[PDB]
C-alpha cells in the first residue's frame, strides 16, 4: 500500500527483490488487486481498450510517415517489378565505411532497409500515388489516436462513468455490432472502391476537392433505384488492360468474372467491391435478430433454454448457460480468442492462393514473411484460448447453477476424451515415424524402389472436383456435362478454370506422396497439442493426486515431495508444456510451405517431389543447401548486404541456448550461490560502505519457467525469421 505495488500490500511488505519482479507481472490482473469491485474492473477494461486503440493508430501513423519521408514510393509506382521498396533510413555511429557503401540500395543516397511488410502494394492498389496522400493519412491517424486518448480520459471520469448493468446488455451490443460495425464499414469500403480506387486503376484521379463533380458511372444512380442492376456490369476491363493507364479499360463497377488479372496476377477490383456490397447487405439484414426497447426480436435466454432434446441424451440441455457466459469474462475471452485464431489461420491460408494486391505475387519474400507471421500469431492466439478456458473453469464456474447441463456432462467424462486423444496421438506418431524411418533406411541401403509411397487420393479427388485435369477423374466441375457445370458455366467458371489450370500460380498446387507424410505429421502435432490443452483445462478443478486443486489457484509451484512427488501439477504448467508443441507444429508447417514454394519458384519441382519422402533429404536439400548464402554474410575477406541477417541468425541461436539454463538448473543451487556472494560482498573492504536496500534472492520456480519459455520463443522466432528472409532474398527466386 506504500511501496511500488500500490495495488497489493502483500507484495509490498516483503523486503526481497521479488517484490519488484512480481510487481510488473501482476499489473494487469484486475481481479487480484485488493478492494476490487465489478464496476472498477469493467471501467478499467474500457480504458485499456481505448489505450490499445490509440497505440494501434499511432503505430500505423508512424509507419505511414516514415514510408512517406524516407521511401521511394513515387519511383516505385512507375516500375513496380524493377524497384526495391524502402522502409526507413539507417543512422548508426558504429557503421564502418564498407557497411555504409554496401547498405545503400535502391535510389537512396544512404543506407536504407528494404521493406518486406508489403505495404507498398497494398497502398498502390487502393489508389495512393503521391507522398502528400501518405502525409495526410498520417495526420488523420494521429488525430484519431488523440481522439481515442481523449475518449478514454473522458470515460474514466465520474460523471460519464457507465454502470455494470450497461456492460451486461448482450442483445443491444450484438445488434449494434452486427449492423453498424460490420455492415456499415463494408458499405463505406464499397463506396471507396467504387469512387476512388477503381478510377485510379483506370488512370483517373479522384480526390477530396473534385469527388463531387465526377460520376463513378455514366448512368448514375438511376439503374440502382429503378431495378436494372445488370447495367452496372456491361463493359468490363479487357484482357489487354494495363494497370494505372487508360489503355483497354472499361466502365463496369460490379462484376463476377472470377480468376486473376493477367498483368498483375491479382483479383479484379470490381469483384472485391461486389463482394463487399453483398457482405454489407447480408450483415445489415442479419443485424436485426435480437430484441431491444421496440418490443420485437428474440431473447437469447429463451433461445438457449428451449433447446433440450427429448429422451434426456443431453442432460438438461442449455439451461443456465446464459448466466454462466454473461457473468464470466474469461468465457467470453476464450470464445473470442478461439474465433480470432481460426480467422487468422484462414487469412494466412487464403492470402497466398488468392492474392488481392497488385504485383505482390511476384514478390516472394513478402509472401513468405506474411504467411509465417500470420501462422505464428494464430498459433499463439489458439494457445491463449485454451489458457483462458482453464482460467474460467478455475475461477468462475458454479457447480450448483450448472447442474446436469452440457458443461456438467463435459466435466463428467474427461477420462474418455483424454484416452481417445492419447490413442489418436500415439497412432499417428507411431505410424508417421515408422514410415519415415523405413524410407530413410531404404534410401540409405541404396534401393529407392522399395520405398513405401502412398498417393493422397482423397485430396486429389477433391481437387479434380474443382476443375483440375492433372489426375484423370471427371467429377462435378471437371465433367463437361453436369448439373453444376451447366448451372455455373455462364458466370464464373470461364475465369476460375483458367486460373486454376495454370501452373505458374499457387492455386491448388499439384501434390504427391511427399505431402501425405507432412499432412499426417501436422495432424499429429494438432492432436497432441489439443490433448495437452484439453487435459490441462479439464483437470484444473481437481484430480486423484490432488482433489483440492481449485483452492490453491491457477498458478502455484507444486504440492511438495509427498505422495511420490508432485511437480508441474497446475494448469499453468499444462499451458507451459503445450507452448512447445505449438511452436513445433507451426515450425513444421512453415518448413513445408517454404520448401515447396522455393522449389516451385526456382524452376525445378522434382527436387521436392523426390527428396521429401525421407528426412535426410529434408536435412540436406533444405537447410544445409540453402544456408550457404546466409552464413557467408561476413567472411575474413569482406561482407555484403546480408551481413546483418547473418548476425541476427547467430544472435537467435545464443538466446535459444540461454533458455536451456533456466529450464534445467533449479533454485537451490543459485540460492546457495547468492548467499555466498552476499557474504563475499559484506566482508570486503572499501565496498561494504555501499549496501543494498532489497535483499537479493534467487528467482522463483514459475518465474524461472516463464523466463526460460520467453528465451526459447525469442530465439526460435528470430532464428527462423533470419534464415527465411536471408535465404529467400539472396536468390530472389
Amino acid at each position: 500500500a506504500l511501496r511500488f505495488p500500490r495495488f497489493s500490500q502483500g507484495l509490498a511488505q516483503d523486503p526481497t527483490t521479488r517484490r519488484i519482479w512480481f510487481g510488473i507481472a501482476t499489473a494487469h490482473d484486475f481481479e487480484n488487486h485488493d478492494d476490487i469491485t465489478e464496476e472498477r474492473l469493467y471501467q478499467n477494461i474500457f480504458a485499456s481498450h481505448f489505450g490499445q486503440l490509440a497505440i494501434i493508430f499511432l503505430w500505423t501513423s508512424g509507419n505511414l510517415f516514415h514510408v512517406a519521408w524516407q521511401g521511394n514510393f513515387e519511383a516505385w509506382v512507375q516500375d513496380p517489378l524493377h524497384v526495391r521498396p524502402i522502409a526507413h533510413a539507417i543512422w548508426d555511429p558504429h557503421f564502418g565505411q564498407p557497411a555504409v557503401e554496401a547498405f545503400t540500395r535502391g535510389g537512396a543516397l544512404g543506407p536504407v532497409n528494404i521493406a518486406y511488410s508489403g505495404v507498398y502494394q497494398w497502398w498502390y492498389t487502393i489508389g495512393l500515388r503521391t507522398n502528400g496522400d501518405l502525409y495526410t493519412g498520417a495526420l488523420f491517424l494521429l488525430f484519431l489516436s488523440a481522439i481515442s486518448l481523449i475518449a478514454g480520459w473522458l470515460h474514466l471520469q465520474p460523471k460519464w462513468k457507465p454502470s455494470v448493468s450497461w456492460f451486461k446488455n448482450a442483445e443491444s451490443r450484438l445488434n449494434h455490432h452486427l449492423s453498424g460495425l460490420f455492415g456499415v464499414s463494408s458499405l463505406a469500403w464499397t463506396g471507396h472502391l467504387v469512387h476512388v480506387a477503381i478510377p485510379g486503376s483506370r488512370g483517373e484521379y479522384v480526390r477530396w476537392n473534385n469527388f463531387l463533380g465526377v460520376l463513378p458511372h455514366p448512368q448514375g444512380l438511376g439503374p440502382l433505384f429503378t431495378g436494372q442492376w445488370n447495367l452496372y456490369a456491361q463493359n468490363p476491363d479487357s484482357s489487354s488492360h494495363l494497370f494505372g493507364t487508360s489503355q483497354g479499360t472499361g466502365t463496369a463497377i460490379l462484376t463476377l468474372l472470377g480468376g486473376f488479372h493477367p498483368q498483375t496476377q491479382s483479383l479484379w477490383l470490381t469483384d472485391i467491391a461486389h463482394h463487399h456490397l453483398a457482405i454489407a447487405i447480408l450483415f445489415l439484414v442479419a443485424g436485426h435478430m435480437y430484441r431491444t426497447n421496440f418490443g420485437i426480436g428474440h431473447s437469447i435466454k429463451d433461445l438457449l433454454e428451449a433447446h433440450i432434446p427429448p429422451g434426456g441424451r443431453l442432460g438438461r440441455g442449455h439451461r443456465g448457460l446464459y448466466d454462466t457466459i454473461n457473468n464470466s469474462i474469461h468465457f467470453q475471452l476464450g470464445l473470442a480468442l478461439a474465433s480470432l485464431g481460426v480467422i487468422t489461420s484462414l487469412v494466412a491460408q487464403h492470402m497466398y492462393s488468392l492474392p488481392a494486391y497488385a504485383f505482390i505475387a511476384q514478390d516472394f519474400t513478402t509472401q513468405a514473411a506474411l504467411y509465417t507471421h500470420h501462422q505464428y500469431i494464430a498459433g499463439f492466439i489458439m494457445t491463449g484460448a485454451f489458457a483462458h478456458g482453464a482460467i474460467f473453469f478455475i475461477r468462475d464456474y458454479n457447480p450448483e447453477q450448472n447442474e446436469d447441463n452440457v458443461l456438467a456432462r463435459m466435466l463428467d467424462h474427461k477420462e474418455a476424451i483424454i484416452s481417445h486423444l492419447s490413442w489418436a496421438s500415439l497412432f499417428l506418431g507411431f505410424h508417421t515415424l515408422g514410415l519415415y524411418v523405413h524410407n530413410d533406411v531404404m534410401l540409405a541401403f541404396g534401393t529407392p524402389e522399395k520405398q513405401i509411397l502412398i498417393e493422397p487420393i482423397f485430396a486429389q479427388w477433391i481437387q479434380s472436383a474443382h476443375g483440375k485435369t492433372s489426375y484423370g477423374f471427371d467429377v462435378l466441375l471437371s465433367s463437361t456435362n453436369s448439373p453444376a457445370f451447366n448451372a455455373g458455366r455462364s458466370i464464373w467458371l470461364p475465369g476460375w478454370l483458367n486460373a486454376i489450370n495454370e501452373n505458374s500460380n499457387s492455386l491448388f498446387l499439384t501434390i504427391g506422396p511427399g505431402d501425405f507424410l507432412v499432412h499426417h505429421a501436422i495432424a499429429l502435432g494438432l492432436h497432441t497439442t489439443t490433448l495437452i490443452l484439453v487435459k490441462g483445462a479439464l483437470d484444473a478443478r481437481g484430480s486423484k493426486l490432488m482433489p483440492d486443486k481449485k483452492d490453491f489457484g491457477y498458478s502455484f509451484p507444486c504440492d511438495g515431495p509427498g505422495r511420490g512427488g508432485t511437480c508441474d501439477i497446475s494448469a499453468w504448467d499444462a499451458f507451459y508444456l503445450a507452448v512447445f508443441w505449438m511452436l513445433n507444429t507451426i515450425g513444421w508447417v512453415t518448413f513445408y510451405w517454404h520448401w515447396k514454394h522455393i522449389t516451385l519458384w526456382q524452376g525445378n519441382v522434382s527436387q521436392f517431389n523426390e527428396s521429401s519422402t525421407y528426412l535426410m533429404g529434408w536435412l540436406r536439400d533444405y537447410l544445409w543447401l540453402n544456408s550457404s548464402q546466409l552464413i557467408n554474410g561476413y567472411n575474413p575477406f569482406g561482407m555484403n548486404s546480408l551481413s546483418v541477417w547473418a548476425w541476427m541468425f547467430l544472435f537467435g541461436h545464443l538466446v535459444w541456448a540461454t533458455g536451456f539454463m533456466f529450464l534445467i538448473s533449479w533454485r537451490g543451487y543459485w540460492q546457495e550461490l547468492i548467499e555466498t556472494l552476499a557474504w563475499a560482498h559484506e566482508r570486503t573492504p572499501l565496498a561494504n560502505l555501499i549496501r543494498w536496500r532489497d535483499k537479493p534472492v534467487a528467482l522463483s520456480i514459475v518465474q524461472a519457467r516463464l523466463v526460460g519459455l520467453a528465451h526459447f520463443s525469442v530465439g526460435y522466432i528470430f532464428t527462423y525469421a533470419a534464415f527465411l528472409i536471408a535465404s529467400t532474398s539472396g536468390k530472389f527466386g
Partner: peptide, 30 residues
C-alpha cells in the same frame, strides 16, 4: 535537415537514462 543526427542520440541514450533514474527513484521511495 540532419534530424537523425540529433534525434537518434536523444532516444538512444538520454531518454533511457532519465526513465531509469525516475523509475528507480519511484521504486525505492517509501
Amino acid at each position: 535537415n540532419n534530424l537523425p543526427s540529433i534525434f537518434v542520440p536523444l532516444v538512444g541514450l538520454v531518454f533511457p537514462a532519465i526513465a531509469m533514474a525516475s523509475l528507480f527513484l519511484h521504486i525505492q521511495k517509501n
